[model samples]
Target: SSGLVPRGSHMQFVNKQFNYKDPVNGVDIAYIKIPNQMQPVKAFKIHNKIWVIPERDTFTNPEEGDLNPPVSYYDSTYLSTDNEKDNYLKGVTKLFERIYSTDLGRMLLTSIVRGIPFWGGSTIDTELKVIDTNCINVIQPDGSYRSEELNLVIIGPSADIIQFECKSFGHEVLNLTRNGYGSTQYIRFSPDFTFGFEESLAGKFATDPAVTLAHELIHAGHRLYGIAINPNRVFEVSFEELRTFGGHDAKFIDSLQENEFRLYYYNKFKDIASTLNKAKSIVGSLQYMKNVFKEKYLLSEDTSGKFSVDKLKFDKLYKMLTEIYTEDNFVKFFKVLNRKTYLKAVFKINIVPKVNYTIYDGFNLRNTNLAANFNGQNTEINNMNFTKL
Candidate 1:
């Protein structure tokens, strides 16, 4: 079986193991972990700092991979024939700047973005390189050019899909059609608003790269860490329900990246940060969606009459959608969705040993020594003591 942490790293955590597939009448069964169930608190705090441990029913690594440690360097590159080379590079630079500015960003970079093998990882170099006309690479801290490293590239407008892969390569070195395929890890980003781009979110990259950058980076991390439940899947379900049954077209999926982007934006920014009023100040496509359709009715109503008489069907629909989108409500809804699986992710549980009643067959209490063995006693019953009866 593959270990949670990467190989070649001598780090261990305070983990307790339990039999998930318990025997029932001499047979074992496989069950799913509930997506939003309460996670058992079995985490460790080594060296006075808490380390991130996988939740019940969640495993980080599946296939045994190479011993890659301390993701301190990530390379950046762009398309050769694309006319938006400068635009892409500027966007890439600005994205990194915003990411490094936040504590959450730093943690994600070391732990998930790069394969972290140790606890409390090291710093990454901010400098990027333009190697050849086609690609940019991450500069190592040692001032050496890293060849065939994990790269982030900005592709042409025509190729507008944003994705991450373990052994992705450039078309020049080895195209996907070819098996050679450069054997490198990289993330591809589209420079224009044509694919999955919202006009409001696609502001000047220099102005704010946090929204888009956060979404893609989370995807990269999700792929690496093997998050047990796909929150995106849950988000998609929620989006559809809100759009269809709830009758809100505000969360429609136009293309591949749209749904994913909407989910991530809400999760990271709106759900978590809105408590402090920070997300309220933030302006993007996501925020715009929340602002416009949250409380307002999409349908027109004739309000010339009294409140009860003028009430439109659209009023209730708007209230339901807004309530569902609220942070606490959605979280609760997710738990219900994964109720069975969530309960199965056990942390600390041990089965009591069974007693063999056959051992005491036809034996009396004295003969069996039930007092000594079972820690309980039965007083002797004699004929004199039962004379009254």
Candidate 2:
């Protein structure tokens, strides 16, 4: 017998029945009730004669009190063109395949499904929906905001669904030029992982679309875990926590960074070490320039040398300093330096705080440290049991 049984307040029986047949098995369907639906929906008997009702589809309008369903998997049904949809499907399939190949990826997947009650045997598809929309806000000539279509990526959990909304590639170059490379204005971006802009000027820094999907999927898991822990609380609280804290949110960033270093480490930047080295060099040069200015100009005791050959040399150095040392230049320099500092700090992480799996204690997804040791002797991987989702 199948291990499937309808549970939760969302699942109930209704008076009406439908003649709808299962698309996969062609089995007779029955009626079921889900929260925030105007009417009861069809349920098909699949998976060894087990009655299973599908999760709410992304295209359908949601009524009041509908908590957005977890993204158990993904599909490209919301994309407008056939080519676009097919490309999305291919990308997602390849992503899952890549993730399933690695122990770290499989663990992440388990974390995703850990909160759901009957996830193993359920035939329902609560797939993440990808929509092509003009989600970017641009100021028009009239001083009003206009929704412009651009090749931008954004993910969020909404009332009806968790979606990855994107635009066509026609405006990609323009968008990148207007915004910084790999800008996180629309999506989350950490030093190790990014969810928004895919391509960068530097090929090594470019993020794969699949990686973005993976990062967003982790966020979706966080939402599901939140919902599973507290059924009575409003679902919007989960979504709000994600949207409000975003990249600055420590738990999600830590989880994403760990995943990148462990699972998708091959796709990461090749010159991280070199970049930090260069940053060190830049800091040295700036310090040298500052020392030279102070020693020759400010700290010197010889007043006669102020107008001599030494003065000429100092003037040349002063000119160089004026040309090179602006407030904006220093700001940009420190920004990159700070980024490298954080990157180094993340790499130095040897241990993570142990997570108590029994409690949902609000966004504490930092259970396992995936980047600790690859040999699996000292890491949390040994304690984890893998399940197929």
Candidate 3:
């Protein structure tokens, strides 16, 4: 997160309710290049202001890794390869916007590229670099680099597919078959950023870095480590209230991270059970509502076009039983309700599950389609068959 103060001596609105609490470090919205209009500086205003933390100027050349944090490691300025002189991100925005436009036959790319100004929740710029045993320099058998591109491609009924292409060396290449595979690669967690990226209209290096790339690398390690890290087995639930209920968020079992061990042994996971369980209730209630309409419309009479144009819609509501009395109009009502919920949840927080991994908290979410950063590392479920499920 970076600051977004007025760029120079001539721009307007230098004081438009700016700087509320000075967003955390490593997250500033500094004014970069002027869009060929004004004083050649600061065109748009960015709201993110978290990148004030200090960081090492050293190149994170995975070769020199055993990763000793800088004497005062603050943000991810250490590995920023996109230097001071780079392409205009505003133009990049236009390119993405153009490609992501629905009118331009890019619903698929649009599905992947939501509105930008993405900010992956850093209060005051936390440490995000993943240093390892030459993690950046380890040589592979195929001689191709161990990185991937999250290319948005197909948008199917349930989800979209990103053509994950592996890139090593410097530029990304189409090298899927490579050696030292699984243990060496993975992609970042921000398949969809939460805070938004369109606001931080600065350098991509400073704004969005390969840290997203490094962040994914950490997940590859945990999955490939071959040992239990508070690995849980079964699912459980508890009561939240008289009606709304909740269930276990994540189950952890074996020897774990200190926190994982504590949560497991002390039964701490139950604390969040009921609160999070509302999600299940939310879905269940929705199903219940569907049933309500089905019976009211009395569609169970099962007449052709009597209540619905499509059998799938009618059939869905017929199953759900709510307070409503008839089933004939159930399909019609469900369509309206579905549309409403989608809009409410599309930009809302903590409602439905979202795909994400944090540069701050490390990896948690999984890339569903291709392991873009998988680097063809013999993909498989872990010993417990707990992966790729």
* Best-performing candidate as measured by lDDT: 2
Ranking 1 against 2 by lDDT, winner:
2
* Tens-place lDDT digits, model 1, residues 1-389: 21212223432221221222222111111121111233222221111111211121122122311222221212122233223333343334333433443444445444332321111011222211222312222234343432222222222221212221122222343222122111122244432221111122122111012333444444333332221122343442533222222213324434354434434423332221222222223221434433322222222223431111113433332223222222223213211111111100111100011121111110112343532322111112211111110
What overall lDDT, based on C-alpha atoms, would model 1 receive against the true structure?
Answer: 0.25
Question: Local distance difference test, per candidate?
Answer: 0.25, 0.26, 0.20
Better of 2 and 3 by TM-score: 2
Clashing pairs in 1: 33-341, 34-341, 34-342, 75-138, 76-136, 77-136
RMSD of 1: 27.7
The list of candidate 2 runs beyond 4 A from truth reads 1-78, 81-84, 117-205, 227-389
Show the lowest summed lDDT stretch of 10 residues, model 3: 336-345
How much is 10 displaced in model 1, in angstroms? 35
Better model by TM-score: candidate 1 vs candidate 2: 2
The true-versus-predicted C-alpha distance at residue 326 of model 1, in Å, is 16
For all predicted structures, in order, the TM-scores are: 0.25, 0.26, 0.18
Ranking by lDDT: 2, 1, 3
